[PDB]
Design a protein around this ligand. Structure first.
Ligand SMILES: CN(C)S(=O)(=O)c1ccsc1
Ligand SMILES: CN(C)S(=O)(=O)c1ccsc1
Ligand SMILES: CN(C)S(=O)(=O)c1ccsc1
Lengths: 280, 274
């Protein structure tokens, strides 16, 4: 397949991008993978910009959504335009047929973390995610793969996949990008009406209140977050949990995670927490 | 940073996964084609046929792994005598530093045949296979047709996860009377060992009877097994070559498994229907 450098090259066949990627790597380029669902916003552009900054980098951005056999925003044209503007040179847009010619046959079984937090009500969700991440990693064989911290549990599970199957790829976690008031950027934010968008600031306010409260201990940090969420009218909290950084249920460093509903829209956010001395 | 020592033409033994990964990557960059032969040690002629097949690829460097899932000396001597340059002998803790956590979940073929008595057996196997492919990154990986259902499941793994390796199935090596080679054979007493030739005799008989149709093939195999004492047959099935249902004709595979005393024996053969 053709590859025009300094232009955006779009491939849909896995064999096409795998051949292009291999050829580029043989000629010294380091292949960077940014896996996405499409509906790209500035939080995805932060991953692209981190990938671009690796010297010698060729950036592959994949766009794929799992089929739902038994609502997700799909803006393809528009995604590719953003990529061109970022000077990405390869978009990989495989069909469902090319990814699952045999339906779901061999799959990845995550460890016990997948049954907690986001997985509690959807016990098979992360098996779906990690199966596609492993396939994309085998098709593209990147040097580095980039994920947002906004989906923190997904990130931890991806690092478990990479460690547990001895994958030769470095996983790069990229900090969440936020709107001016603190709201974490998400494709789902478009589903908030104006009142809901106003109320949704409480997630990030609660988290950053807790991160500063934490000089007083874990309980004070948790109670500060809960109070702020309790003060927010249309916010229905699904969970608010403080865990160790690898999402084991805690020492001096932790991660605080929240999930909440605003009407039908489910929002997540999370923050680094340092208990006692030092931080803040 | 710095590649481990590798001495061409000798047996280089590595136990650290990062060590064999680095030496494999460095040899591949110099032109060599990395061939991987995964084993559980206790090597016999069945394993050396995999080694010989890997050796004959031009430019090959042969990696033999030895690992058992939760004499090392004698195995290593056999590999040395075969001209193998790389043995990979990881510990359990090297392979599972975080315990059993992420794993491969096979498709439904894994619950059939060997998966009857051992329903998690293949998930264990495919997990280790996938790790060894990622550590070693071979151009081709060699498995015996003796474990046919495993071989089929590995081809499903490689297709389903878009693995860039070629899977090579190598024909079963047999003792002079046809018994397929296995470290289990030495447990058989003389009565059991004489009866065990019924598995291969049944399969070959079926493969020749198959000009008369699928049912002739199966009835010929079941006659030969019925003539043996102390051979408790667990299954005898004719399937297509991918272990789906046997088509009306074309290529298939006949598989058998039996218990003689406490020893489970397996065999299988290509069948062409009519
Ligand atoms: C009904 N699903 C969306 S599906 O993946 O089984 C599908 C896709 C094209 S037809 C059915
Ligand atoms: C983790 N993702 C953004 S991915 O591109 O591996 C994916 C997972 C389910 S659809 C796309
Ligand atoms: C299929 N084997 C011979 S392997 O080396 O991948 C393995 C599987 C469980 S222990 C060794």
């Amino acid at each position: 397949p053709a590859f025009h450098p300094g232009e955006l090259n779009v491939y849909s066949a896995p064999g096409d991008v795998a051949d292009v990627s291999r050829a580029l790597r043989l000629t010294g380029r380091r292949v960077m993978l940014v896996p996405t669902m499409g509906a790209l916003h500035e939080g995805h552009l932060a991953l692209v910009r981190a990938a671009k900054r690796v010297p010698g980098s060729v950036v592959v951005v994949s766009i794929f959504v799992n089929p739902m056999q038994f609502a997700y925003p799909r803006t393809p044209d528009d995604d590719l335009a953003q990529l061109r503007a970022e000077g990405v040179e390869i978009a990989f847009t495989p069909t469902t047929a090319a990814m699952y010619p045999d339906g779901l046959r061999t799959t990845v079984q995550p460890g016990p973390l997948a049954a907690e937090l986001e997985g509690g009500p959807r016990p098979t969700h992360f098996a779906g995610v990690l199966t596609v991440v492993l396939k994309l990693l085998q098709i593209v064989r990147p040097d580095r793969v980039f994920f947002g911290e906004k989906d923190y549990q997904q990130l931890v599970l991806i690092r478990q996949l990479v460690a547990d199957f001895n994958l030769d790829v470095a996983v790069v976690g990229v900090p969440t990008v936020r709107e001016a008031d603190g709201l974490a950027m998400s494709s789902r934010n478009r589903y908030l009406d104006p009142a809901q968008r106003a109320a949704a600031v409480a997630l990030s306010a609660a988290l950053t209140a807790a991160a500063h409260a934490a000089t007083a201990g874990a309980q004070a940090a948790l109670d500060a977050a809960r109070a702020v969420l309790d003060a927010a009218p249309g916010v229905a909290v699904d969970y608010l949990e403080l865990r160790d950084i690898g999402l084991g249920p805690l020492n001096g460093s932790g991660r605080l995670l929240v999930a909440a509903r605003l009407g039908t829209t489910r929002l997540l956010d999370n923050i680094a927490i340092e208990i006692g001395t030092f931080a803040g």
